Amino acid sequence: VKNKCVNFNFNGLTGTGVLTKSNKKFLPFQQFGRDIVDTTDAVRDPQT
Amino acid sequence: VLHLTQDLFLPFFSNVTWFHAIDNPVLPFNDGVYFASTEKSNIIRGWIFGTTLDSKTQSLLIVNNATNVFIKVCEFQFCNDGVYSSANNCTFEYVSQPFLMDLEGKQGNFKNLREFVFKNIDGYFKIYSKHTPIIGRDFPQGFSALEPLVDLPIGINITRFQTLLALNRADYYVGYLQPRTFLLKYNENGTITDAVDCALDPLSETKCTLKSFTVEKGIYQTSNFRVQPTESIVRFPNVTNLCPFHEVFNATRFASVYAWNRTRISNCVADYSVLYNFAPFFAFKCYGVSPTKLNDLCFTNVYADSFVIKGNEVSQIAPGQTGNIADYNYKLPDDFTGCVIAWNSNKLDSKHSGNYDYWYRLFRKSKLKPFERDISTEIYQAGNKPCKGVKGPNCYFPLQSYGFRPTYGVGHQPYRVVVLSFELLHAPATVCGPKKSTNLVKNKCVNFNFNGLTGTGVLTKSNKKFLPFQQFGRDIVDTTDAVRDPQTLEILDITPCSFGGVSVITPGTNTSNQVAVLYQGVNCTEVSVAIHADQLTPTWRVYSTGSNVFQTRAGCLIGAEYVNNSYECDIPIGAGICASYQTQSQSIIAYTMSLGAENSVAYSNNSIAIPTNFTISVTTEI
Amino acid sequence: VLHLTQDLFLPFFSNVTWFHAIDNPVLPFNDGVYFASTE
Amino acid sequence: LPVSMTKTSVDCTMYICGDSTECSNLLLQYGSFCTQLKRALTGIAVEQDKNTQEVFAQVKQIYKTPPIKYFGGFNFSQILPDPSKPSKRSPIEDLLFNKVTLADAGFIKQYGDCLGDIAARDLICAQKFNGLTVLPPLLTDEMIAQYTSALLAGTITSGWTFGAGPALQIPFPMQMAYRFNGIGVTQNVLYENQKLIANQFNSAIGKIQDSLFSTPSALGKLQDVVNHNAQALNTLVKQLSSKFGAISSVLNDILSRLDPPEAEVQIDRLITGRLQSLQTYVTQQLIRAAEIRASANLAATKMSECVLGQSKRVDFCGKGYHLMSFPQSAPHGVVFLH
Amino acid sequence: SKFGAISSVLNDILSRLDPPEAEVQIDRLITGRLQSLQTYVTQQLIRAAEIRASANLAATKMSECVLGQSKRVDFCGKGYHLMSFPQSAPHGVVFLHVTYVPAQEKNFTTAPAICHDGKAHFPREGVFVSNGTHWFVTQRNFYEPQIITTDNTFVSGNCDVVIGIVNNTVYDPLQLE
Amino acid sequence: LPVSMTKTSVDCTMYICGDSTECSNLLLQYGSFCTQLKRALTGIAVEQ
Ligand SMILES: *[C@@H]1O[C@H](CO)[C@@H](O[C@@H]2O[C@H](CO)[C@@H](O)[C@H](O)[C@@H]2O)[C@H](O)[C@H]1NC(C)=O
Ligand SMILES: *[C@@H]1O[C@H](CO)[C@@H](O[C@@H]2O[C@H](CO)[C@@H](O)[C@H](O)[C@@H]2O)[C@H](O)[C@H]1NC(C)=O
Ligand SMILES: *[C@@H]1O[C@H](CO)[C@@H](O[C@@H]2O[C@H](CO)[C@@H](O)[C@H](O)[C@@H]2O)[C@H](O)[C@H]1NC(C)=O
Ligand SMILES: *[C@@H]1O[C@H](CO)[C@@H](O[C@@H]2O[C@H](CO)[C@@H](O)[C@H](O)[C@@H]2O)[C@H](O)[C@H]1NC(C)=O
Ligand SMILES: *[C@@H]1O[C@H](CO)[C@@H](O[C@@H]2O[C@H](CO)[C@@H](O)[C@H](O)[C@@H]2O)[C@H](O)[C@H]1NC(C)=O
Ligand SMILES: *[C@@H]1O[C@H](CO)[C@@H](O[C@@H]2O[C@H](CO)[C@@H](O)[C@H](O)[C@@H]2O)[C@H](O)[C@H]1NC(C)=O
Ligand SMILES: *[C@@H]1O[C@H](CO)[C@@H](O)[C@H](O)[C@H]1NC(C)=O
Ligand SMILES: *[C@@H]1O[C@H](CO)[C@@H](O)[C@H](O)[C@H]1NC(C)=O
Ligand SMILES: *[C@@H]1O[C@H](CO)[C@@H](O)[C@H](O)[C@H]1NC(C)=O
Ligand SMILES: *[C@@H]1O[C@H](CO)[C@@H](O)[C@H](O)[C@H]1NC(C)=O
Ligand SMILES: *[C@@H]1O[C@H](CO)[C@@H](O)[C@H](O)[C@H]1NC(C)=O
Ligand SMILES: *[C@@H]1O[C@H](CO)[C@@H](O)[C@H](O)[C@H]1NC(C)=O
Ligand SMILES: *[C@@H]1O[C@H](CO)[C@@H](O)[C@H](O)[C@H]1NC(C)=O
Ligand SMILES: *[C@@H]1O[C@H](CO)[C@@H](O)[C@H](O)[C@H]1NC(C)=O
Ligand SMILES: *[C@@H]1O[C@H](CO)[C@@H](O)[C@H](O)[C@H]1NC(C)=O
Ligand SMILES: *[C@@H]1O[C@H](CO)[C@@H](O)[C@H](O)[C@H]1NC(C)=O
Ligand SMILES: *[C@@H]1O[C@H](CO)[C@@H](O)[C@H](O)[C@H]1NC(C)=O
Ligand SMILES: *[C@@H]1O[C@H](CO)[C@@H](O)[C@H](O)[C@H]1NC(C)=O
């Protein structure tokens, strides 16, 4: 469920937040996302 | 982002060895290998790894094929050219999409250059590849990132490496990786556009420490420089007499725990290999010191306590424990600087018909403080009777029997225990390890090991007034200053190695790439002799042509020539010296800063200057 | 240096007992003993 | 008035983990706790250099005194530079340098004689043994005196005009008459008692030197600053001999005595002790640098007002009606002669 | 930063161990982050004190230079201050000091006083200046020569104590009328 | 305008280890951590 504050457990990466569609350019070998200060920002759906 | 990583990378502007094929040398594999080749369609097939490449240690193979690969980890024997002749104890096969992708635009001019990187960090064999169209007419200088393909856990030992060939009726570019810190610049789309090394050039180091790719004009403090010691000297004392450790461990009547035999070890060379020899060890739990690192320390005194106890009582004996022995017979101190020893003795403390020569106390009026002996036969009081005489009810004998027979359990077998006590404090050591006494070298940064005092520095003659009992020196701040030589009875001062600090003076990178290096607070004839001997910690080797050296009052500047003119300060260095980028056709010059235009006033007895005009000036303040 | 130490020392301006010989009483030993003699 | 303090460039890595790779790896787990310290100390050093620049570099053109010295009967030999002395400093400026003793010069390059210290090595070699170095000031104590000489020779030959625009020469008796007229007394008073006022000025200038000579410490502020910096550095060094609850206080000892898996705990204790000590030092240095910056701003304002003109604010430039002021440079400070 | 803990994520470390053991790692992370936050707060306090000092200086500069004319030298810009204009800036203020700066100057001559007849004359507010042949009076900061007249000068003296006195005549508008 | 504030003379030993010899011995292992504090408080009082 998107655009709704939910607890997520993507591939053992526990946390909480609001997730939605994005226009990142994840390379085929990429799995996670991060920012300048090293906080997980984007994740790739294991079944999608 | 400008993320900075520290990992195994091929150094920039490094040595890469170019081969040719028209036999197949075995290139050593260490910390990973960079592989790059350029072929028309296909001339290279695969690679071989492993140690000794024979049928005695697990090997590896990455041979590609027309449509798949043949990765496996096995026990190949040889081929000497069908690439193997043995797969006996071999598992972990793997087949997938080929690593080789080649395309042509209706012509052979598109000689795609393929780059590979392999490494074996904590097993987990990693392979990265990238196929670029830049033809390979010359090894390109444009940046091309490498993306991973596979990641498989061989978990084996690899030291040697080979490369297969192909058949037919300019390649082999090999580089070696090293642990370096890299700063990588990422595109908005997530690719890699440019990266800079952080141990190659002074400008690169400033660019790393102020993470960015544009370095503004100024002087930046990046790191510190240290003169690495050349030779390591160890000067142990003047004794070669081996300990009676053999006598301690070859006694015939190790006493009971209630009355523990206590010996002293002094005036020794203590090698514990003879200790390892006469011991089918069962318990070597050592607390104060590490048993592996035990032959490189000196103890002022060593005490050897010996007694025989039962199987569980071995686990009972340790700093801060509990039990009948740990409380009433032997209490090791909480801050115990030493370690115990235990091995089976079922042949000397046992005999047919039994043996009860040994004893132990379970009945004491209170606990036993560390290293206290309570050898006494007094009946433990129970209730309120003054009981005296024979033993019976309510009147208990304090010490009972460790009756040992050759047929018990392991928990009840007659273990032999000997505990050792060490005192590793600042004191004149008498018992030392078997380490040899090397020579002595003065006026050179050396790692010294004077009588167990480990450290580094420069040692030389001194005119101290060391009293006969003195051993060390110090200062009001409690740091070791001088150590008396045990085999020469002389006085040697200790010096810092070379500790300082390197500052790089550069104009903006958008202007020029030239830099100058400042070694703060060091007479830099010292660095000149140090830089020739290659014992300086900084690996970024700035040039020294003789014209670029200037012993300032704040160190000395290398890379900028001194001009005797005076200009306004542009980059403040220190002690009235400023450096700036000026045309010659361009270089960096150091000069004494000018306080201002030299002006002289015309004061006189009756001369006055009165302004006949004026101006209006508008200033700003932030 | 003006190094400062904390250890067993004879107190300044303390009580010291002067004996004589011409029997040999036993003195208690505790935390050490300072012995001085002229002959 | 203090103007600046000693500039330090503490090395976190060397101070906390002397040449020990295991200790460096353990320290790397704390993040950028020491990068902040290095940045703060660099900012402090730059701020000290800026303070000195603000206080002294008030004039852009360096003037020189006339070859003859006859300022209408006023005697300035005590404050003017002395050519005979190699340092080119005033006789009153010499006493300030001789009455202040610096524990650490810093601009000594003392490496090379720590081996030759013969006796027990001193505070400076001891600090060098544990990576505690001090940078030298950008403006040397020789060119600061040159700035002072230019500023003082601008206010005796051109009045206050050289602080506003071009320097316009004017006889010193007339400048004195104008300064008198600025406080509400007409110029005829000075033009009638010129000899008497010259005698009074000479007597005061002469007796200020003896007052600075015979006093125990009239420069207690500069010595206070120097002693505070030296004592903070000494206390920082003395924290290296504390166990902090570890087995021993020597990294080379606990490293060569225990295996790494067990020595990691003792190393962590030493890390958490030394990092706290270094942070306390850095915070105290920040506070002291702020205080010094405030004092240097006050000194710069006092210079710009009392020296570069006449100030009407009572009791600012000395007690009484202000006339002029002469600057004198002192170790890590400035001295005013109101 | 791990701060010596097994993991650097509270969510990860919470679901990876039971609370009795995870308490140690949580204590380590807390004792690291609390010290980091305290360092941040102390640095912010010091920087805020410095900014407060600078803001007090800016307010004083406004009240003096902008709301009037300040006689303190080199306070409201370099030169002789006339007025100022404020400009707002991001997290700060910008002043436009308008200063009067002198210009081309000429050596003329000077005399502390002028003796007409046994009495020393001094300028009321100005300098005694000389073209080279005729003595005049004028201001200090601008050359506006005027004929010497008994209103430009006040008389007090005896022509014998002033050093450097110069002979000439001072005019009076009263004898002629 | 404020001119001064309260002058304090915090005691390390009594504040941290109330009349406990074991705690005093443990505190002595930290070196001269708090002699700095006593000097700082004395300096504040004198300055005020
Ligand atoms: C990141 O990726 C985007 C989509 O793949 C790129 O945008 C494209 O730009 C091309 C022109 O270069 C268009 O033809 C296309 O329609 C799309 O807009 C974008 O350029 C790229 N950014 C990079 C590589 O920096
Ligand atoms: C503990 O046992 C040691 C070996 O059995 C004793 O060492 C030797 O003891 C013999 C006498 O039994 C000595 O002649 C010899 O020189 C050596 O010291 C040691 O004395 C003994 N100690 C105690 C306290 O019993
Ligand atoms: C004082 O200085 C003024 C400028 O600083 C002079 O004004 C100049 O006038 C000339 C024309 O004569 C212009 O060409 C020039 O741009 C400037 O405006 C002014 O003349 C001068 N006065 C005297 C008396 O020297
Ligand atoms: C200005 O004041 C000086 C004092 O520093 C006078 O110098 C003196 O010179 C005499 C010898 O002539 C010394 O004995 C004395 O110690 C001092 O140095 C100087 O003469 C004086 N000059 C004038 C013009 O007043
Ligand atoms: C002295 O100052 C005088 C100003 O009044 C100048 O005299 C002028 O001389 C001309 C004739 O030469 C007169 O016509 C005029 O009225 C004025 O008096 C004179 O130049 C000046 N002297 C010098 C040396 O500058
Ligand atoms: C100014 O003019 C005075 C006469 O009006 C001069 O006084 C004269 O002084 C001379 C000696 O110098 C006497 O001999 C004579 O009787 C008369 O008193 C005065 O000197 C002169 N001063 C200057 C500085 O020119
Ligand atoms: C996940 O598996 C299901 C069933 O095997 C399949 O229909 C689906 O496409 C898979 N999703 C992905 C992303 O592979
Ligand atoms: C690469 O090898 C050549 C040949 O030995 C050598 O001259 C050169 O210095 C090497 N490159 C570097 C960066 O050392
Ligand atoms: C090449 O090797 C792969 C590896 O599995 C194998 O499957 C294939 O049959 C071989 N031959 C060709 C023509 O691909
Ligand atoms: C595989 O290894 C075992 C290890 O003991 C050995 O006994 C066996 O002979 C090996 N298999 C071979 C050599 O084919
Ligand atoms: C791998 O082989 C090398 C070469 O003999 C050896 O030095 C090293 O100890 C081996 N490593 C392991 C983990 O066995
Ligand atoms: C004791 O020494 C003798 C010497 O002959 C030796 O035979 C015996 O093995 C030694 N025993 C032990 C336990 O070291
Ligand atoms: C050390 O021992 C050797 C041989 O016993 C002797 O020649 C030398 O003088 C000794 N040195 C000292 C300092 O006693
Ligand atoms: C430091 O300066 C120079 C350059 O090394 C040389 O005289 C010597 O090494 C040192 N001299 C002094 C006086 O310290
Ligand atoms: C020019 O510079 C040199 C040092 O490079 C110096 O010895 C010489 O005195 C200088 N010349 C002048 C005129 O200053
Ligand atoms: C000023 O006058 C005095 C004596 O009257 C003389 O010594 C000095 O040289 C004169 N200076 C000038 C610049 O005229
Ligand atoms: C030493 O003993 C005498 C005699 O009892 C006594 O009076 C004196 O106070 C003692 N000294 C001290 C320091 O108590
Ligand atoms: C005044 O005269 C002196 C004497 O040469 C000269 O140096 C100075 O420049 C003159 N001032 C001027 C022209 O404003």
Residue numbers in the entry:
A (entry chain B): 534 to 581
B (entry chain A): 47 to 68, 80 to 138, 158 to 210, 212 to 246, 263 to 677, 689 to 726
C (entry chain C): 47 to 68, 80 to 96
D (entry chain C): 727 to 1064
E (entry chain A): 968 to 1144
F (entry chain B): 727 to 774
Can you quote the paper on this entry?
The dense glycan shield consisting of 22–23 N-glycosylation sequons per protomer is an essential feature of SARS-CoV-2 S architecture. The glycans have been shown to play intrinsic and extrinsic roles in protein folding, modulating conformational activation and immune evasion. The transition to the ‘up’ state exposures of RBD for the binding to hACE2 is also a prerequisite for S-mediated viral fusion, directly correlating with infectivity. Here, we dissected the role of N354-linked glycosylation, acquired by BA.2.86 sub-lineages, as a RBD conformational control element in attenuating viral infectivity.
To further verify the role of N354 glycosylation in modulating RBD up/down disposition, four additional modified constructs, BA.2.86-T356K, predicted to remove glycosylation at N354, XBB.1.5-K356T and BA.2.75-K356T, predicted to acquire N354 glycan, together with BA.2.86-ins483V as a control, were characterized, and their structural features were compared with the ancestral strain. We observed that N354 glycosylation dramatically increased the proportion of the ‘closed’ form from 19% to 79% in BA.2.86, 50% to 75% in BA.2.75, and 45% to 90% in XBB.1.5, making the ‘closed’ form the dominant population. However, the insertion of V483 had little effect on the modulation of the RBD conformation, suggesting the ‘closed’ and ‘open’ form transition was not due to the general effects of mutations in RBD but the specific presence of N354 glycosylation.
